[PDB]
């Protein structure tokens, strides 16, 4: 399935992902696209921050959902 | 230096580490104590997951810091 990520400049990227993908798996994909290490990413969906050990489906993230990338400011 | 680890049962144990120890090195020490393989460990400090590759110092982890052990499911 396709999802969207809104990046640090408010651009929208598209990733191919599976419902069973964990949030750390999604971070890694964002790293390849955006050059932001996973321990420096916060991922927001529908206004809430997502935990690393959960799947996308655990959060009811579906086809064409949008995640928001936010840069950690205080360090890894 | 002495760090703490909160285990899967919620009990705290102590590890002897140095600040230049990497996270993968801390995972090893945890495997010795707890019998969890490193590739089945997620380690949390201050509400965030720690990357393999980085040192403890990289994360400003100090003496009496508590890391949280979480089993990958």
Swiss-Prot record, chain B:
Q: What is this protein called?
A: Ubiquitin
After translation, the protein is modified as follows: Phosphorylated ubiquitin specifically binds and activates parkin (PRKN), triggering mitophagy. Phosphorylation does not affect E1-mediated E2 charging of ubiquitin but affects discharging of E2 enzymes to form polyubiquitin chains. It also affects deubiquitination by deubiquitinase enzymes such as USP30. Mono-ADP-ribosylated at the C-terminus by PARP9, a component of the PPAR9-DTX3L complex. ADP-ribosylation requires processing by E1 and E2 enzymes and prevents ubiquitin conjugation to substrates such as histones.
Domain of life, per UniProt, equals Eukaryota
How does the record say this protein sits in the membrane?
Peripheral membrane protein
* Source organism: Homo sapiens
* Full protein stretch here: 77 to 149 of 685
Domain Ubiquitin-like positions: 1-73
Q: What does this protein do?
A: Exists either covalently attached to another protein, or free (unanchored). When covalently bound, it is conjugated to target proteins via an isopeptide bond either as a monomer (monoubiquitin), a polymer linked via different Lys residues of the ubiquitin (polyubiquitin chains) or a linear polymer linked via the initiator Met of the ubiquitin (linear polyubiquitin chains).
Which locations, inside or outside the cell, does it occupy?
Answer: Cytoplasm; Nucleus; Mitochondrion outer membrane
């Amino acid at each position: 399935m396709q999802i969207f990520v809104k990046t640090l400049t408010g651009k929208t990227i598209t990733l191919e992902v599976e419902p069973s993908d964990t949030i750390e798996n999604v971070k890694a994909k964002i790293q390849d696209k955006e050059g932001i290490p996973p321990d420096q990413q916060r991922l927001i969906f529908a206004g809430k921050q997502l935990e690393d050990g959960r799947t996308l489906s655990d959060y009811n993230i579906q086809k064409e959902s949008t995640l928001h990338l936010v840069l950690r400011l205080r360090g890894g």
